[PDB]
Amino acid sequence: GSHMEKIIKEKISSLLSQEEEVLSVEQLGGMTNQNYLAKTTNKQYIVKFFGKGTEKLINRQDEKYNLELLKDLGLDVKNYLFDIEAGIKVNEYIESAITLDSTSIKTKFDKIAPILQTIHTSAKELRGEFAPFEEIKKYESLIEEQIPYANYESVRNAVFSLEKRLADLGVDRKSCHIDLVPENFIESPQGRLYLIDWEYSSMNDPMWDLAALFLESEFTSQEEETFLSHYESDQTPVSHEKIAIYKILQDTIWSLWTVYKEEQGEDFGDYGVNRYQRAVKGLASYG
Ligand SMILES: Nc1ncnc2c1ncn2[C@@H]1O[C@H](COP(=O)(O)O)[C@@H](O)[C@H]1O
């Protein structure tokens, strides 16, 4: 039983009646060590332990508010606990739920485009103002080692040069999810599709979210065009250039996230190296 699992057991004890007990806390699948299934006498809970070393990256109070603010959209699953002290989310467990991946997401544009419209047109004022270039600096501060990626100064300066272009185009400010990996979509056995894991949610340009959806599921040009056709409306305008720019910023940011996570003891192999190289590729294609 890990330290993280012991802390989870303690936090869940507050959700139980005098009779009930925590039976087990086990690590769920996935890339990171954040996700756990907790079993109690009469209840199962999905747990995301996101707080470890992320105090300066994920503003826990911002995100606790964002949960209660976003609840009536009906997109996320039910929350039972959001622990500010350690950064731990305790949610409902949906039995026999299907987690989406790139292939399955591509069959469900009829559901997913309206979902993204719902969030981007919510008119909700989330706590948090996403600043991608400040985000880069946050990771740079937290990382102890000499940056392990090749040709970093030239790449960094090219990435930071995109700030001026974004200012010229004009950056929009809407409620965004910020982390549209396909595995953040889960389907109930009865058919309802959820969008989960809003830990990064913030006010941002909606083209960030589109870039993330497209990049994280490796959409083809045909899939991008088809999705944009579905998603585009007067209240959800589309900018292809912004999408291209945000893809580069995402690969940069998540490559730095990788270094920091590995410094804390995780092993993601060449995940970060490859994302960084894709930023390099994107910079060349953009220019
Ligand atoms: N309410 C739920 N019921 C069943 N599985 C879930 C639930 N919420 C999250 N999960 C799973 O846990 C993962 C959450 O972390 P992530 O892998 O980053 O999406 C999802 O991919 C789902 O597979």
CA of 263 to the centre of ligand 1 (A): 25
CA of 165 to the centre of ligand 1 (A): 36
What residues line ligand 1, using a CB cutoff of 6 Å?
28, 30, 35, 46, 77, 91-94, 97, 99, 183-184, 186, 196-197
* Total residues belonging to the chain: 287
Written as six digits, the tokens of 5 are 């699992």
Q: Cα(85)–Cα(68) distance, rounded to whole angstroms?
A: 18
Q: Which candidate, 139, 35, 16, 31, places its Cα nearest to that of 88?
A: 35
> Under a CB-based contact definition with an 8 Å cutoff, are residues 13 and 45 in contact?
no
Q: Cα(81)–Cα(101) distance, rounded to whole angstroms?
A: 27
Buried/exposed 55-79: b ≥16 CB within 10 Å, e otherwise: eebbbbeebbbbbebbeeeebbbee
**Three-class DSSP category at 39:** strand
Distances from the Cα of 255 to the Cαs of 92, 140, 154, 250, in angstroms?
31, 11, 16, 8
Domain range 1-96, its CATH number among 2.60.40.10, 3.40.50.10260, 1.10.1740.10, 3.30.200.20: 3.30.200.20
Resolution of this entry in Å? 1.5
Residue 46 per-residue DSSP state: E
> Under a CB-based contact definition with an 8 Å cutoff, are residues 105 and 185 in contact?
yes
Kindly report each contact of residues 131-134 with a partner whose C-beta sits within 8 Å and lies 24 or more positions away, as own/partner: 132/208, 132/246, 132/249, 132/253, 133/160, 133/163
> Under a CB-based contact definition with an 8 Å cutoff, are residues 175 and 210 in contact?
no
**97-287 has CATH 3.90.1200.10 classification:** yes
Place of tokens 């508010």: 65
H and E: helices and strands count for the chain = 11, 10
Q: Any idea what the Cα angle at residue 41 is, between residues 40 and 43, rounded to 5°? A: 60
Which atom of ligand 1 is nearest to 99's Cα?
Answer: 23
Would you kindly state where each structural domain of the chain is located, as residue ranges? Answer: 1-96, 97-287
Rounded to 10 degrees, the C-alpha dihedral 71/37/58/164 comes to: -80
